Structures are given as C-alpha cells and as structure tokens.
C-alpha cells in the first residue's frame, strides 16, 4: 500500500478477466471495478458503459457523482 | 430635479445646518443665556427662534445684535437676501433648562464662589423651579493638583431605558480656570405635565 500504478488501458489478461467474472457479482461501480482489476477508473467507466452498450450489464442510477450497475437476472 | 439634491443628502444637510447654527449660537451667546435653537423651514423664507433667558441682552441696542446675527447667518449660509429672520423667545421656567444652569454655575465659578456653595445654590434653585430631581457633577483640578469629582444629587434621577431620553435634560460645559478645565454636567429630571 504505497502506490497503485493502475493500468490506464487494458491488456488481454485484464480484458478476459473483465469479460469472464465482472458480470458475476451484484455490485458494479467504477470504483469497485478499478479496485478489483487494478485499472485506472476512467477506463473502468468506459468499460462499464461499453458492457452496458453490449447489453449484459444493467444500470440502476446513472448519477454524476456515482453510477451503479448490476448483473442480469437469471431464470 | 438633478439640480436638487437627493432626499438623504438634503436631510443630512439640514441636520448639519442645525448643528452648525447651534454651535455658532452657543459660542456667541453663551454669556447671554442662550439655551437652544428651533428653526421652522419654509421655502418662501426661514425663521430662526433663539431660546434664551436674557433675551433683552440678546437683542442689542435697538436690535443691533440681532441684526448683526441675522446678517452673519445670511452671509455664512448663503441665504437669499431678506429670506431669513431671527427672533428671540424667553425660556419659561429657566431653572428647568439644564443648559442655562450650566452657564449659571460657570458664571459663579468664574466669579470665584466656592464650588460646594455654588453647586448647592444651583441645585436648590433647580428644585425650587420644580423638578422631579437633579444631579450636578463638577470634575477637574479642585483644590490640589490631583483631579477630583464632586456629585450633588437630590430627588428622582433615572438612568436606563427610553424615558431617560425625554425625561432628563443633560448639559455639559467646560470652564476655563487658570489651573485647567472644570467639567460641569447637569442632569434635570423634568416633571410630568399634560400641558
């Protein structure tokens, strides 16, 4: 816990993890995505809205200070 | 119009004129029993009433003193010629004018009366003239070099709240002695009257 050196852009070993396990857990916010993936956070925002445009992530709030997503329901 | 000054500046100018005239009249007529000035301002012409005790002394030989005062006021304040008139009115019950008693006590002290005797005489005269109470305090270099104050209070004398504004007459006067300055404060609680 000295510096983050978070990734500004994805690699293969980060993009595959994003596409394989990010749409699994309930809470999807840019901050939690950045903390879980060691990415910048602006990149996390862009990736999350890209997933929404893909249609596999459900938005709930979309506020200036906080945007909140969730997984699609199964059943 | 634009030539005419605003209402706020006009009223402040009126107050300034009142204060300046009051100071000039106080300085010129202090020994003549001057007490206060009232002015009823009308656009056609203005009248200045001088409340005095020795009004016959204020009005000089055939009104020469009042003529001089009128001309002086006219010149100083730039009134149009003949548009300002000064009259003198004698104060009723001069013992109740706290200002007039201040110059009376100053006259006694300059004459050389003992300060205790002079203050007691003024206090007795005020009560005889009729007041709810009075308080005369004289401060300064009494007797020795060390400053002292003497207070002579008798009767009713309120200090706090609104009624002190309109129930007591307050006057402060300086007296110049060869040792220094004596400060005289005279407060007179006026009696209530429906008239």
């Amino acid at each position: 816990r000295d510096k983050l050196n978070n990734l500004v852009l994805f690699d293969k070993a980060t993009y595959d993890k994003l596409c394989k396990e990010v749409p699994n857990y309930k809470l999807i916010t840019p901050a939690v995505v950045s903390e879980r993936l060691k990415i910048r956070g602006s990149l996390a925002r862009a990736a999350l809205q890209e997933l929404l445009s893909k249609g596999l992530i459900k938005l709930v709030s979309k506020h200036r200070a906080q945007v909140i997503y969730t997984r699609n329901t199964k059943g | 119009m634009a030539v005419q000054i605003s209402k706020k500046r006009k009223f402040v100018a009126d107050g300034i004129f009142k204060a300046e005239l009051n100071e000039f009249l106080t300085r010129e007529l202090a020994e003549d029993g001057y007490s206060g000035v009232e002015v009823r301002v009308t656009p056609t012409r203005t009248e200045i009433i001088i409340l005095a005790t020795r009004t016959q002394n204020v009005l000089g030989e055939k009104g020469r003193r009042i003529r001089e005062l009128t001309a002086v006021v006219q010149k100083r304040f730039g009134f149009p010629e003949g548009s300002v008139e000064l009259y003198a009115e004698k104060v009723a019950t001069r013992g109740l004018c706290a200002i007039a008693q201040a110059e009376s006590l100053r006259y006694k002290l300059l004459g050389g009366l003992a300060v205790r005797r002079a203050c007691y005489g003024v206090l007795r005269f005020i009560m005889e003239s009729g007041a709810k109470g009075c308080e005369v305090v004289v401060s300064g270099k009494l007797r020795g070099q060390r400053a002292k104050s003497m207070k002579f209070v008798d009767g009713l004398m309120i200090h706090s709240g609104d009624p002190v504004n309109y129930y007591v007459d307050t006057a402060v006067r300086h007296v110049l002695l060869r040792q220094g300055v004596l400060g005289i404060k005279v407060k007179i609680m006026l009696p209530w009257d429906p008239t």
């Binding site: 990734l7 500004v8 852009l9 994805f10 980060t14 993009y15 990149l43 862009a46 990736a47 890209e50 | -």
Partner: protein
Amino acid sequence: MSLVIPEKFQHILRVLNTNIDGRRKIAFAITAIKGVGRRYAHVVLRKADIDLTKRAGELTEDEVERVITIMQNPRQYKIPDWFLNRQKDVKDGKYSQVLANGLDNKLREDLERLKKIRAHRGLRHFWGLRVRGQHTKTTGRRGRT
C-alpha cells in the same frame, strides 16, 4: 473503444529535451514540457486536430512531430500574438513561445541583464529576496532558515 492497450504504445516519450509520461491524456501529458501549460497544450492539440480523448502513448510518431512543430512554430498556425510567452522580446522584439531549456536560458538571460544593469530588481534577485515589492518582515523565512 477502450480496448486492450495498442501494441505500438510508448509508455515513455522523449519530446524535446524533457521526458513525458504516456499513461496520462495527451493534453495534460505535453504539459510536462516546460513552457507548456494547460491552455497552450489544449490550443495546440486543437490546432493539430487530434483526438483530445486519446492518451499520449497511443499517439503516432507523425502526430507527435506534428504537434511538436505546432508548439515550436505557433505563429504560422493562427495562434494569436497575445497567447504566447515571449511576446515582444527585450532583445530582438519577436513574438514567440519559447518552451525548452531555451525558456531557462531566456530566464537566466533576463536575470543576468538586470544584474549587469544593476537595476533594483536585479539586485533583489542577486540578494535572493523578493522582487515584486511585497513585505519580507514575516514571510519567506523558509529559504533563510
């Protein structure tokens, strides 16, 4: 589309005599060059007509030299004379934006011109005190003790 990092990504660029970090956006990455601020950087990127969103690392070398020459020659690209640093030079009177170790040499040249002319501001610089005529009685004690 915020994909994986491009293969031809330069994490470290060597524009001019300074070094910049390619992980920040280009507009705030060229501000690392001395003599270039946020305003100048944004206007030269606007003139060079590149994507303000993309990072400095994914900027191709032709675009890099294009923005470099935009910075070095701002007068030819309609950048106004009031926007520059070295307007109306004290030596040759040529409007320019000096952004290099050249900026440092111009600064030391102005300082040494004042020192050799023995002006009051030059003497203040030589003594190491304030030059803009502000009070020194209580502030600035860090540089002395």
